[PDB]
Amino acid sequence: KFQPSLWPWDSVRNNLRSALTEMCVLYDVLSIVRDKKFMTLDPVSQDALPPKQNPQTLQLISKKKSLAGAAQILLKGAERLTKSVTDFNSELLRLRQHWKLRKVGDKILGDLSYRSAGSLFPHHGTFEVIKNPLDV
Amino acid sequence: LANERLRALEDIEREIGAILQNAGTVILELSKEKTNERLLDRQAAAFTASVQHVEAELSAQIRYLTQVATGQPHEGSSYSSRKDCQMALKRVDYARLKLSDVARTCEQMLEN
Amino acid sequence: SKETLLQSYNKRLKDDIKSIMDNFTEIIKTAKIEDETQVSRATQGEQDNYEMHVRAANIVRAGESLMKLVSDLKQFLILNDFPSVNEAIDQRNQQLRTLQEECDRKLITLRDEISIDLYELEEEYYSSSS
C-alpha cells in the first residue's frame, strides 16, 4: 500500500475517490439504462404513505443544524481575525521616515548613496528590503 | 501620516466587525426561538452598514491614491543633514576624550 | 503602470464586496424552507448543509482578501504618497538642524572657557622662575 508521495491529504482523497466511485456508478447505471439492451425501464404508478410529517420536521432540524455549522465557521473566522490583529508596515513607516525607498516589480528597493545629495559617484546604493520583522 | 493609516486600521477592524455581524445574524437565525426579531433587524442593518461604509472608505482611498500617484521614485532625501549631525556629534566625542586626558594629567600633577 | 495598479485595486475591492454580499444573500435564500418534490429530504438536507458551509468559507476568504487589499493600499501609501514623504523629510531635517546647532553652541562655549584657562596657565608657566 503506497501512493504518489501524498502523506498529508490522503483521507480527503479517500472521501473524494469514494465519491468518484459512486459517481462512476451513476454514470454507469444511467448509461446502461439509456441503451435498451442489458437494462430497461418500465413506467409503474406506485404510491407511498409517509408515516411521519417528514418535510416539516426533517427540514426544520436539518436547517437548524446547517445554520449552526455555518455560524460556527463564520464566528470562528471572526475571532481568528480578532486575535490576528491584536507589524511590517510600521517598520516600513520608520524606514521610509529615515531612508529613501521605492518599488520596482514586486521588489522594494532603497537608495544608499549620496546621489540625491549631489555626488556623481558611479556606484548605486540599491539595498533590498526583505521581510524576515524587516531586514535589509 | 497617522490619519490615512489610522483610517486603514479602522477599516481592518470594521472588516472584522462585518464578519462578526454576519456570524451573529446567522447565530440568531439558528435559534430554536428567536424572540428579539427587532434585534435581528438591528444586526442586519449593522451588517449592511458595515459592508457599505467599508466600501465607501476603500473606494475613497483608491480615489485619493489615484489623485496623488506618479509612478516616479521621489528623488528627495534627508541624507546631508544626518551627515552633518553625525559630524557634529563626533566633534563633541573628540572633545570629550581630550578633556578626559587633560583632567587625567591634572590629577597626576595634583596627586603628588 | 500606476493607473493599472489602482484599477486592479478597485477591481479587487468591488469583487470582494460583491462576493460577501452574494454569499450572505444565497445562504439566507437557502435558509428558506420549501416543500419537497423529487428531492428526497435526506439528500436535500445534506446538499443544503454543504452549500451553507462552503458559502461561509467563501465569506471568510473574501474577508481575508479585503485584509490583503488593505495591506497593499497601506504599502502604496507608505511608499509613494508624495505629501507625507515631504513632511517627514522636512521634520527630520529640522530636528537634525536643531541637534547640530546645540552641539556647536556647546563646543563654542567650551572653547572660550578653555581659552581663558589656557591664558592663565600660559602666564603662570612662562613667568615661572625655575
mmCIF file of C-alpha atoms in Angstrom:
data_model
loop_
_atom_site.group_PDB
_atom_site.id
_atom_site.type_symbol
_atom_site.label_atom_id
_atom_site.label_comp_id
_atom_site.label_asym_id
_atom_site.label_seq_id
_atom_site.Cartn_x
_atom_site.Cartn_y
_atom_site.Cartn_z
ATOM 1 C CA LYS A 1 0.000 0.000 0.000
ATOM 2 C CA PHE A 2 1.682 3.170 -1.274
ATOM 3 C CA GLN A 3 0.545 6.270 -3.156
ATOM 4 C CA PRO A 4 2.342 9.032 -5.192
ATOM 5 C CA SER A 5 4.070 10.552 -2.063
ATOM 6 C CA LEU A 6 0.899 12.173 -0.555
ATOM 7 C CA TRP A 7 1.216 11.504 3.190
ATOM 8 C CA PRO A 8 -0.840 14.517 4.208
ATOM 9 C CA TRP A 9 -4.090 14.944 2.261
ATOM 10 C CA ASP A 10 -4.822 11.241 1.982
ATOM 11 C CA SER A 11 -8.182 10.997 3.767
ATOM 12 C CA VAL A 12 -9.624 13.809 1.658
ATOM 13 C CA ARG A 13 -8.547 11.753 -1.352
ATOM 14 C CA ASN A 14 -10.241 8.683 0.129
ATOM 15 C CA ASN A 15 -13.541 10.535 0.512
ATOM 16 C CA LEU A 16 -13.224 12.146 -2.918
ATOM 17 C CA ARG A 17 -12.381 8.879 -4.646
ATOM 18 C CA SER A 18 -15.282 7.148 -2.901
ATOM 19 C CA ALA A 19 -17.410 9.931 -4.373
ATOM 20 C CA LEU A 20 -15.706 9.249 -7.704
ATOM 21 C CA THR A 21 -16.635 5.558 -7.479
ATOM 22 C CA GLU A 22 -20.298 6.203 -6.761
ATOM 23 C CA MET A 23 -20.410 8.914 -9.425
ATOM 24 C CA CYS A 24 -18.990 6.410 -11.904
ATOM 25 C CA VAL A 25 -21.738 4.113 -10.588
ATOM 26 C CA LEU A 26 -24.304 6.792 -11.504
ATOM 27 C CA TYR A 27 -22.803 7.352 -14.958
ATOM 28 C CA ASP A 28 -22.653 3.567 -15.430
ATOM 29 C CA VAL A 29 -26.234 2.892 -14.368
ATOM 30 C CA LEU A 30 -27.762 5.729 -16.362
ATOM 31 C CA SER A 31 -25.723 4.812 -19.444
ATOM 32 C CA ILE A 32 -26.708 1.134 -19.331
ATOM 33 C CA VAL A 33 -30.261 2.320 -18.590
ATOM 34 C CA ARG A 34 -30.024 4.637 -21.596
ATOM 35 C CA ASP A 35 -29.479 1.783 -24.030
ATOM 36 C CA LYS A 36 -32.378 -0.640 -24.352
ATOM 37 C CA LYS A 37 -30.073 -3.660 -24.147
ATOM 38 C CA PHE A 38 -28.785 -5.038 -20.784
ATOM 39 C CA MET A 39 -31.187 -2.768 -18.808
ATOM 40 C CA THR A 40 -34.730 -1.494 -19.355
ATOM 41 C CA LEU A 41 -37.345 0.840 -17.927
ATOM 42 C CA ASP A 42 -40.939 0.212 -17.041
ATOM 43 C CA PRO A 43 -43.353 3.000 -16.068
ATOM 44 C CA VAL A 44 -45.017 1.971 -12.821
ATOM 45 C CA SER A 45 -47.549 4.005 -10.882
ATOM 46 C CA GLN A 46 -46.826 3.270 -7.241
ATOM 47 C CA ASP A 47 -47.537 5.375 -4.172
ATOM 48 C CA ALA A 48 -46.020 5.711 -0.703
ATOM 49 C CA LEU A 49 -47.501 6.813 2.607
ATOM 50 C CA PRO A 50 -45.237 8.998 4.765
ATOM 51 C CA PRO A 51 -45.520 7.665 8.326
ATOM 52 C CA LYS A 52 -44.489 10.952 9.953
ATOM 53 C CA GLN A 53 -44.691 14.542 8.666
ATOM 54 C CA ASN A 54 -41.198 14.312 7.231
ATOM 55 C CA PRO A 55 -40.622 17.588 5.239
ATOM 56 C CA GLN A 56 -41.585 19.962 8.089
ATOM 57 C CA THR A 57 -39.659 18.279 10.901
ATOM 58 C CA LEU A 58 -36.717 16.987 8.838
ATOM 59 C CA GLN A 59 -36.231 20.326 7.048
ATOM 60 C CA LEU A 60 -36.527 22.048 10.437
ATOM 61 C CA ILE A 61 -33.865 20.072 12.289
ATOM 62 C CA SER A 62 -31.548 19.839 9.280
ATOM 63 C CA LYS A 63 -31.733 23.564 8.554
ATOM 64 C CA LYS A 64 -31.099 24.461 12.190
ATOM 65 C CA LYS A 65 -28.075 22.148 12.212
ATOM 66 C CA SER A 66 -26.822 23.574 8.903
ATOM 67 C CA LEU A 67 -27.216 27.132 10.148
ATOM 68 C CA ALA A 68 -25.426 26.082 13.350
ATOM 69 C CA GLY A 69 -22.403 24.820 11.444
ATOM 70 C CA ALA A 70 -22.348 27.884 9.186
ATOM 71 C CA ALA A 71 -22.431 30.245 12.154
ATOM 72 C CA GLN A 72 -19.696 28.176 13.786
ATOM 73 C CA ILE A 73 -17.256 28.526 10.883
ATOM 74 C CA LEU A 74 -18.138 32.214 10.429
ATOM 75 C CA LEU A 75 -17.661 33.175 14.068
ATOM 76 C CA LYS A 76 -14.516 31.056 14.370
ATOM 77 C CA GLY A 77 -13.044 33.017 11.466
ATOM 78 C CA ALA A 78 -14.220 36.231 13.117
ATOM 79 C CA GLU A 79 -12.451 35.555 16.411
ATOM 80 C CA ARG A 80 -9.414 34.440 14.424
ATOM 81 C CA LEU A 81 -9.419 37.923 12.914
ATOM 82 C CA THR A 82 -9.762 39.493 16.378
ATOM 83 C CA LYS A 83 -6.745 37.616 17.735
ATOM 84 C CA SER A 84 -4.994 38.095 14.381
ATOM 85 C CA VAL A 85 -4.961 41.888 14.510
ATOM 86 C CA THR A 86 -4.299 42.067 18.249
ATOM 87 C CA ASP A 87 3.918 44.944 12.236
ATOM 88 C CA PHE A 88 5.734 45.024 8.916
ATOM 89 C CA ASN A 89 4.285 48.247 7.576
ATOM 90 C CA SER A 90 5.005 50.104 10.804
ATOM 91 C CA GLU A 91 8.651 49.288 10.235
ATOM 92 C CA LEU A 92 8.200 50.464 6.663
ATOM 93 C CA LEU A 93 6.893 53.723 8.139
ATOM 94 C CA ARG A 94 10.024 54.131 10.237
ATOM 95 C CA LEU A 95 12.357 53.003 7.447
ATOM 96 C CA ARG A 96 10.800 55.375 4.940
ATOM 97 C CA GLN A 97 10.956 58.128 7.535
ATOM 98 C CA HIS A 98 14.723 57.767 7.660
ATOM 99 C CA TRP A 99 15.648 56.346 4.255
ATOM 100 C CA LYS A 100 14.788 56.745 0.596
ATOM 101 C CA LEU A 101 12.784 53.857 -0.833
ATOM 102 C CA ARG A 102 10.920 52.785 -3.964
ATOM 103 C CA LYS A 103 9.181 49.789 -5.512
ATOM 104 C CA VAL A 104 10.068 48.054 -8.766
ATOM 105 C CA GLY A 105 8.058 45.000 -9.735
ATOM 106 C CA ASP A 106 7.218 43.246 -6.506
ATOM 107 C CA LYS A 107 10.619 44.178 -5.068
ATOM 108 C CA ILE A 108 11.081 47.081 -2.688
ATOM 109 C CA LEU A 109 14.453 48.765 -3.003
ATOM 110 C CA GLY A 110 16.216 51.698 -1.464
ATOM 111 C CA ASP A 111 18.962 54.152 -2.281
ATOM 112 C CA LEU A 112 22.013 54.306 -0.048
ATOM 113 C CA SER A 113 24.175 56.741 -1.976
ATOM 114 C CA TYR A 114 24.546 60.495 -1.772
ATOM 115 C CA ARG A 115 23.456 60.919 -5.379
ATOM 116 C CA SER A 116 20.342 62.621 -4.087
ATOM 117 C CA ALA A 117 22.691 64.815 -2.066
ATOM 118 C CA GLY A 118 24.909 65.630 -5.031
ATOM 119 C CA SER A 119 27.656 63.036 -5.503
ATOM 120 C CA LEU A 120 28.432 61.836 -9.015
ATOM 121 C CA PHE A 121 29.876 58.652 -7.746
ATOM 122 C CA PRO A 122 29.486 55.818 -10.282
ATOM 123 C CA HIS A 123 28.015 53.351 -7.801
ATOM 124 C CA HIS A 124 24.367 52.861 -6.942
ATOM 125 C CA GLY A 125 23.439 52.102 -3.382
ATOM 126 C CA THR A 126 20.483 49.807 -4.041
ATOM 127 C CA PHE A 127 19.687 47.821 -0.917
ATOM 128 C CA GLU A 128 16.774 45.413 -0.883
ATOM 129 C CA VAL A 129 14.096 45.245 1.790
ATOM 130 C CA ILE A 130 13.397 41.697 2.947
ATOM 131 C CA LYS A 131 10.540 40.563 5.156
ATOM 132 C CA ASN A 132 12.074 38.427 7.897
ATOM 133 C CA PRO A 133 10.160 41.868 11.140
ATOM 134 C CA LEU A 134 12.189 43.588 8.468
ATOM 135 C CA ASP A 135 15.723 43.244 7.159
ATOM 136 C CA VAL A 136 17.965 44.840 4.558
ATOM 137 C CA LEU B 1 0.534 60.303 8.064
ATOM 138 C CA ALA B 2 -1.202 58.837 11.078
ATOM 139 C CA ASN B 3 -4.522 59.981 9.582
ATOM 140 C CA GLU B 4 -4.817 57.803 6.457
ATOM 141 C CA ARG B 5 -3.031 54.933 8.189
ATOM 142 C CA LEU B 6 -5.467 55.069 11.106
ATOM 143 C CA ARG B 7 -8.255 55.038 8.536
ATOM 144 C CA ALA B 8 -6.762 51.812 7.160
ATOM 145 C CA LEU B 9 -6.580 50.398 10.706
ATOM 146 C CA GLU B 10 -10.226 51.279 11.295
ATOM 147 C CA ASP B 11 -11.201 49.531 8.058
ATOM 148 C CA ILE B 12 -9.324 46.447 9.277
ATOM 149 C CA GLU B 13 -11.392 46.464 12.471
ATOM 150 C CA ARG B 14 -14.598 47.032 10.522
ATOM 151 C CA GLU B 15 -13.896 44.077 8.231
ATOM 152 C CA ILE B 16 -13.721 42.051 11.431
ATOM 153 C CA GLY B 17 -16.991 43.667 12.503
ATOM 154 C CA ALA B 18 -18.600 42.741 9.177
ATOM 155 C CA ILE B 19 -17.673 39.090 9.589
ATOM 156 C CA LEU B 20 -18.838 39.081 13.210
ATOM 157 C CA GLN B 21 -22.147 40.669 12.247
ATOM 158 C CA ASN B 22 -22.674 38.031 9.552
ATOM 159 C CA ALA B 23 -21.967 35.379 12.165
ATOM 160 C CA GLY B 24 -24.206 36.943 14.812
ATOM 161 C CA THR B 25 -27.108 37.250 12.387
ATOM 162 C CA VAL B 26 -26.979 33.589 11.426
ATOM 163 C CA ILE B 27 -26.456 32.800 15.137
ATOM 164 C CA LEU B 28 -29.770 34.455 15.901
ATOM 165 C CA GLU B 29 -31.456 32.762 12.957
ATOM 166 C CA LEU B 30 -30.256 29.326 14.075
ATOM 167 C CA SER B 31 -32.008 29.686 17.429
ATOM 168 C CA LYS B 32 -34.992 27.453 18.132
ATOM 169 C CA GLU B 33 -36.883 30.535 19.260
ATOM 170 C CA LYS B 34 -35.552 33.941 18.197
ATOM 171 C CA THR B 35 -37.750 36.379 20.109
ATOM 172 C CA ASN B 36 -35.682 39.517 19.501
ATOM 173 C CA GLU B 37 -36.573 39.788 15.807
ATOM 174 C CA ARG B 38 -36.137 43.543 16.175
ATOM 175 C CA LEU B 39 -32.583 42.809 17.287
ATOM 176 C CA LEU B 40 -32.265 40.577 14.225
ATOM 177 C CA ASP B 41 -33.253 43.581 12.121
ATOM 178 C CA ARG B 42 -30.745 45.722 14.017
ATOM 179 C CA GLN B 43 -27.934 43.234 13.427
ATOM 180 C CA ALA B 44 -28.908 43.042 9.752
ATOM 181 C CA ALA B 45 -28.768 46.828 9.412
ATOM 182 C CA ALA B 46 -25.459 46.763 11.291
ATOM 183 C CA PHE B 47 -24.057 44.201 8.848
ATOM 184 C CA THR B 48 -25.151 46.133 5.783
ATOM 185 C CA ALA B 49 -23.950 49.441 7.222
ATOM 186 C CA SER B 50 -20.563 47.858 7.940
ATOM 187 C CA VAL B 51 -20.185 46.481 4.405
ATOM 188 C CA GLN B 52 -21.350 49.763 2.887
ATOM 189 C CA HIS B 53 -19.008 52.037 4.790
ATOM 190 C CA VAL B 54 -16.092 49.645 4.293
ATOM 191 C CA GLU B 55 -16.813 50.001 0.571
ATOM 192 C CA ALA B 56 -17.065 53.776 0.982
ATOM 193 C CA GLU B 57 -13.743 54.160 2.803
ATOM 194 C CA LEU B 58 -11.827 51.896 0.443
ATOM 195 C CA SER B 59 -13.305 53.496 -2.675
ATOM 196 C CA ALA B 60 -12.451 56.952 -1.342
ATOM 197 C CA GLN B 61 -8.890 55.913 -0.592
ATOM 198 C CA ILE B 62 -8.389 54.342 -4.019
ATOM 199 C CA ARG B 63 -9.665 57.617 -5.496
ATOM 200 C CA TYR B 64 -7.295 59.670 -3.348
ATOM 201 C CA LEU B 65 -4.425 57.357 -4.271
ATOM 202 C CA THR B 66 -5.349 57.850 -7.913
ATOM 203 C CA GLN B 67 -5.063 61.595 -7.396
ATOM 204 C CA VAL B 68 -1.562 61.536 -5.879
ATOM 205 C CA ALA B 69 0.165 58.679 -7.708
ATOM 206 C CA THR B 70 3.001 59.424 -10.109
ATOM 207 C CA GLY B 71 4.941 56.239 -10.814
ATOM 208 C CA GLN B 72 8.207 58.052 -10.097
ATOM 209 C CA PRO B 73 10.532 57.190 -7.250
ATOM 210 C CA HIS B 74 10.612 60.509 -5.265
ATOM 211 C CA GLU B 75 14.133 61.920 -5.626
ATOM 212 C CA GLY B 76 14.004 63.800 -2.305
ATOM 213 C CA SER B 77 16.038 62.797 0.736
ATOM 214 C CA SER B 78 17.372 63.838 4.123
ATOM 215 C CA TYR B 79 20.906 62.473 3.993
ATOM 216 C CA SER B 80 23.037 65.614 4.199
ATOM 217 C CA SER B 81 21.507 66.818 7.449
ATOM 218 C CA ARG B 82 22.090 63.438 9.058
ATOM 219 C CA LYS B 83 25.685 63.568 7.849
ATOM 220 C CA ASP B 84 26.259 66.997 9.371
ATOM 221 C CA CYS B 85 24.628 65.915 12.615
ATOM 222 C CA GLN B 86 26.910 62.877 12.783
ATOM 223 C CA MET B 87 29.972 65.047 12.246
ATOM 224 C CA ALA B 88 28.820 67.414 14.997
ATOM 225 C CA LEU B 89 28.346 64.546 17.428
ATOM 226 C CA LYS B 90 31.771 63.140 16.618
ATOM 227 C CA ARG B 91 33.295 66.581 17.244
ATOM 228 C CA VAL B 92 31.674 66.512 20.676
ATOM 229 C CA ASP B 93 33.012 62.998 21.316
ATOM 230 C CA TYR B 94 36.546 64.007 20.316
ATOM 231 C CA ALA B 95 36.392 66.953 22.701
ATOM 232 C CA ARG B 96 35.163 64.656 25.471
ATOM 233 C CA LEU B 97 38.103 62.274 25.049
ATOM 234 C CA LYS B 98 40.571 65.143 25.035
ATOM 235 C CA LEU B 99 39.029 66.649 28.174
ATOM 236 C CA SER B 100 39.369 63.283 29.882
ATOM 237 C CA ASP B 101 43.069 63.249 29.021
ATOM 238 C CA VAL B 102 43.664 66.795 30.293
ATOM 239 C CA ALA B 103 41.816 66.022 33.528
ATOM 240 C CA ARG B 104 43.904 62.885 33.938
ATOM 241 C CA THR B 105 47.162 64.819 33.595
ATOM 242 C CA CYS B 106 45.834 67.379 36.085
ATOM 243 C CA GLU B 107 45.093 64.573 38.531
ATOM 244 C CA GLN B 108 48.615 63.243 38.036
ATOM 245 C CA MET B 109 50.057 66.673 38.763
ATOM 246 C CA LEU B 110 47.931 67.334 41.843
ATOM 247 C CA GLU B 111 48.341 63.747 43.037
ATOM 248 C CA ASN B 112 51.904 64.239 44.272
ATOM 249 C CA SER C 1 1.577 51.244 -14.596
ATOM 250 C CA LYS C 2 0.345 53.217 -11.531
ATOM 251 C CA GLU C 3 -3.073 53.661 -13.212
ATOM 252 C CA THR C 4 -3.157 49.873 -13.931
ATOM 253 C CA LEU C 5 -2.311 49.040 -10.265
ATOM 254 C CA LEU C 6 -5.019 51.422 -8.961
ATOM 255 C CA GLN C 7 -7.596 49.921 -11.387
ATOM 256 C CA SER C 8 -6.598 46.397 -10.170
ATOM 257 C CA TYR C 9 -7.121 47.525 -6.541
ATOM 258 C CA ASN C 10 -10.575 48.893 -7.499
ATOM 259 C CA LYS C 11 -11.428 45.579 -9.217
ATOM 260 C CA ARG C 12 -10.366 43.553 -6.154
ATOM 261 C CA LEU C 13 -12.445 45.745 -3.793
ATOM 262 C CA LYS C 14 -15.553 45.541 -5.982
ATOM 263 C CA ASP C 15 -15.166 41.751 -6.316
ATOM 264 C CA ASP C 16 -14.703 41.173 -2.544
ATOM 265 C CA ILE C 17 -17.709 43.294 -1.536
ATOM 266 C CA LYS C 18 -19.838 41.628 -4.226
ATOM 267 C CA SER C 19 -18.783 38.130 -3.064
ATOM 268 C CA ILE C 20 -19.565 38.803 0.612
ATOM 269 C CA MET C 21 -22.990 40.209 -0.257
ATOM 270 C CA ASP C 22 -23.827 37.366 -2.702
ATOM 271 C CA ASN C 23 -22.744 34.584 -0.333
ATOM 272 C CA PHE C 24 -24.728 36.032 2.581
ATOM 273 C CA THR C 25 -27.848 36.519 0.415
ATOM 274 C CA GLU C 26 -27.574 32.965 -1.022
ATOM 275 C CA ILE C 27 -27.192 31.459 2.487
ATOM 276 C CA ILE C 28 -30.304 33.411 3.575
ATOM 277 C CA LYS C 29 -32.226 32.187 0.471
ATOM 278 C CA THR C 30 -31.283 28.502 1.044
ATOM 279 C CA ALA C 31 -32.305 29.003 4.685
ATOM 280 C CA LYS C 32 -35.825 29.181 3.287
ATOM 281 C CA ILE C 33 -37.787 26.028 3.976
ATOM 282 C CA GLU C 34 -39.689 24.826 0.909
ATOM 283 C CA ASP C 35 -41.933 21.868 0.210
ATOM 284 C CA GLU C 36 -40.063 18.931 -1.303
ATOM 285 C CA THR C 37 -40.784 17.303 -4.655
ATOM 286 C CA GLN C 38 -38.415 14.665 -6.120
ATOM 287 C CA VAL C 39 -35.519 15.806 -3.855
ATOM 288 C CA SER C 40 -35.543 13.063 -1.125
ATOM 289 C CA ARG C 41 -35.388 15.013 2.205
ATOM 290 C CA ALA C 42 -32.079 13.449 3.339
ATOM 291 C CA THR C 43 -30.179 14.304 0.123
ATOM 292 C CA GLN C 44 -31.697 17.811 0.015
ATOM 293 C CA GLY C 45 -30.592 18.442 3.620
ATOM 294 C CA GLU C 46 -27.008 17.247 3.137
ATOM 295 C CA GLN C 47 -26.679 19.298 -0.081
ATOM 296 C CA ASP C 48 -28.005 22.389 1.778
ATOM 297 C CA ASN C 49 -25.555 21.811 4.682
ATOM 298 C CA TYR C 50 -22.642 21.577 2.239
ATOM 299 C CA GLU C 51 -23.774 24.746 0.424
ATOM 300 C CA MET C 52 -24.032 26.749 3.673
ATOM 301 C CA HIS C 53 -20.611 25.615 4.916
ATOM 302 C CA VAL C 54 -18.927 26.344 1.552
ATOM 303 C CA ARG C 55 -20.539 29.818 1.351
ATOM 304 C CA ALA C 56 -19.410 30.666 4.915
ATOM 305 C CA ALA C 57 -15.885 29.581 3.951
ATOM 306 C CA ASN C 58 -16.161 31.848 0.860
ATOM 307 C CA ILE C 59 -17.245 34.818 3.074
ATOM 308 C CA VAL C 60 -14.230 34.244 5.374
ATOM 309 C CA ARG C 61 -11.933 34.033 2.289
ATOM 310 C CA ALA C 62 -13.371 37.333 0.979
ATOM 311 C CA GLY C 63 -12.640 38.930 4.371
ATOM 312 C CA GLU C 64 -9.033 37.681 4.185
ATOM 313 C CA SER C 65 -8.759 39.146 0.632
ATOM 314 C CA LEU C 66 -10.090 42.511 1.943
ATOM 315 C CA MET C 67 -7.345 42.379 4.623
ATOM 316 C CA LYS C 68 -4.808 41.748 1.807
ATOM 317 C CA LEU C 69 -6.209 44.752 -0.147
ATOM 318 C CA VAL C 70 -5.913 46.991 2.944
ATOM 319 C CA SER C 71 -2.281 45.842 3.402
ATOM 320 C CA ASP C 72 -1.421 46.568 -0.276
ATOM 321 C CA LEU C 73 -3.066 50.036 -0.059
ATOM 322 C CA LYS C 74 -1.064 50.742 3.142
ATOM 323 C CA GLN C 75 2.162 49.754 1.332
ATOM 324 C CA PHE C 76 1.314 52.025 -1.640
ATOM 325 C CA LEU C 77 0.586 54.965 0.715
ATOM 326 C CA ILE C 78 3.840 54.444 2.716
ATOM 327 C CA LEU C 79 5.906 54.192 -0.498
ATOM 328 C CA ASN C 80 4.519 56.834 -2.876
ATOM 329 C CA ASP C 81 2.089 59.347 -1.337
ATOM 330 C CA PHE C 82 4.351 62.377 -2.076
ATOM 331 C CA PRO C 83 2.995 64.882 0.549
ATOM 332 C CA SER C 84 3.828 62.706 3.589
ATOM 333 C CA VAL C 85 7.326 61.988 2.354
ATOM 334 C CA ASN C 86 7.833 65.742 2.150
ATOM 335 C CA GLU C 87 6.564 66.378 5.665
ATOM 336 C CA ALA C 88 8.688 63.518 7.010
ATOM 337 C CA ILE C 89 11.784 64.826 5.222
ATOM 338 C CA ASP C 90 11.183 68.362 6.452
ATOM 339 C CA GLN C 91 10.585 67.299 10.048
ATOM 340 C CA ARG C 92 13.710 65.124 10.001
ATOM 341 C CA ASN C 93 15.761 67.985 8.547
ATOM 342 C CA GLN C 94 14.570 70.487 11.127
ATOM 343 C CA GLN C 95 15.218 68.119 14.025
ATOM 344 C CA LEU C 96 18.736 67.329 12.834
ATOM 345 C CA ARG C 97 19.497 71.023 12.312
ATOM 346 C CA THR C 98 18.467 71.773 15.892
ATOM 347 C CA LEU C 99 20.705 68.998 17.211
ATOM 348 C CA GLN C 100 23.643 70.289 15.160
ATOM 349 C CA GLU C 101 23.129 73.822 16.462
ATOM 350 C CA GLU C 102 23.020 72.637 20.065
ATOM 351 C CA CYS C 103 26.288 70.724 19.593
ATOM 352 C CA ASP C 104 28.020 73.714 18.029
ATOM 353 C CA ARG C 105 26.905 76.112 20.765
ATOM 354 C CA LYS C 106 28.237 73.708 23.397
ATOM 355 C CA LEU C 107 31.562 73.418 21.577
ATOM 356 C CA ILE C 108 31.989 77.168 21.134
ATOM 357 C CA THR C 109 31.319 77.893 24.812
ATOM 358 C CA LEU C 110 33.737 75.098 25.736
ATOM 359 C CA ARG C 111 36.410 76.666 23.541
ATOM 360 C CA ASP C 112 36.013 80.082 25.161
ATOM 361 C CA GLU C 113 36.241 78.743 28.721
ATOM 362 C CA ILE C 114 39.232 76.553 27.847
ATOM 363 C CA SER C 115 40.892 79.553 26.199
ATOM 364 C CA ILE C 116 40.603 81.652 29.359
ATOM 365 C CA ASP C 117 42.096 78.802 31.395
ATOM 366 C CA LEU C 118 44.890 78.469 28.839
ATOM 367 C CA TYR C 119 45.688 82.164 29.198
ATOM 368 C CA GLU C 120 46.056 81.800 32.963
ATOM 369 C CA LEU C 121 48.209 78.682 32.598
ATOM 370 C CA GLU C 122 50.430 80.317 29.979
ATOM 371 C CA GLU C 123 51.069 83.300 32.237
ATOM 372 C CA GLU C 124 51.895 81.011 35.150
ATOM 373 C CA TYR C 125 54.147 78.650 33.206
ATOM 374 C CA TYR C 126 56.100 81.244 31.254
ATOM 375 C CA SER C 127 56.534 83.522 34.241
ATOM 376 C CA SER C 128 57.795 80.665 36.413
ATOM 377 C CA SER C 129 61.227 81.273 37.884
ATOM 378 C CA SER C 130 62.596 77.682 37.954
#
